[PDB]
Amino acid sequence: LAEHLLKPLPADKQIETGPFLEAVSHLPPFFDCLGSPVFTPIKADISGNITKIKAVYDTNPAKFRTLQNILEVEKEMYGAEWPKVGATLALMWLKRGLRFIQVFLQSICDGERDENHPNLIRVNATKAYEMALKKYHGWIVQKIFQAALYAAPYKSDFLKALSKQNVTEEECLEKIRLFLVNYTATIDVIYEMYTQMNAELNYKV
Ligand SMILES: CCCCCCCC
Numbered sequence: 001l002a003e004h005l006l007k008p009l010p011a012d013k014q015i016e017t018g019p020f021l022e023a024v025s026h027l028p029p030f031f032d033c034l035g036s037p038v039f040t041p042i043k044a045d046i047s048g049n050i051t052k053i054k055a056v057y058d059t060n061p062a063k064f065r066t067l068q069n070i071l072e073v074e075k076e077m078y079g080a081e082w083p084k085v086g087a088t089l090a091l092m093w094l095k096r097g098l099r100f101i102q103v104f105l106q107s108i109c110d111g112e113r114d115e116n117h118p119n120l121i122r123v124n125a126t127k128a129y130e131m132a133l134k135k136y137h138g139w140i141v142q143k144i145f146q147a148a149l150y151a152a153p154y155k156s157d158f159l160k161a162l163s164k165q166n167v168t169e170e171e172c173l174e175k176i177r178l179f180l181v182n183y184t185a186t187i188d189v190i191y192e193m194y195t196q197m198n199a200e201l202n203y204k205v
């Protein structure tokens with residue numbers, strides 16, 4: 001996780017597209033080791049969105065040099081169908097997935113737990129879901145999340161699995177905290193960009 005740290009934000013707070021995509025492309029493969037095929041569709045959404053942004057980038061790397069470039073170029077390119085199109089739509093959903101992971105990991109690191117059930121991660125996942133995704137899901141997908149939550153491993157197994165090497169839980173969590181610095185900062189900047197460009201949509205799925 002901290003082997004693929006995101007770069008820091010530059011002074012102008014512009015996020016270069018290519019390095020950003022390389023960095024977040026290391027996140028999906030962790031889903032293969034949470035111990036359930038319930039996570040396969042989740043990996044596909046995140047990866048699928050990464051792939052969609054990459055494919056738009058590849059058609060003109062200079063024009064789409066930054067994430068900001070993408071939104072303003074596509075706004076101009078598409079007119080009325082924007083922002084519900086292209087890389088802008090893919091990144092709208094990617095950000096919510098990345099924020100989910102962010103909120104989840106930070107909750108874990110901050111020592112949040114169910115006193116009654118200390119070695120589960122359900123309360124952590126549930127907070128992340130409420131903060132990042134829930135308001136954009138209709139009742140059917142929300143019910144599916146509630147089912148999928150039971151596929152979550154134990155906290156100990158989860159942390160040990162990320163340490164995939166010979167390291168204490170405390171050490172592992174300090175590495176996660178390190179990863180979270182630039183990760184959170186970058187996602188914040190993407191969320192701010194959506195707000196300023198008025199590119200955020202609230203439709204539910
Ligand atoms: C550099 C971006 C590569 C696209 C990978 C898509 C799956 C995470």
Ligand SMILES: CCCCC
Pocket residue numbers: 027028030031101104
């Ligand atoms: C990349 C780890 C994801 C946990 C939700």
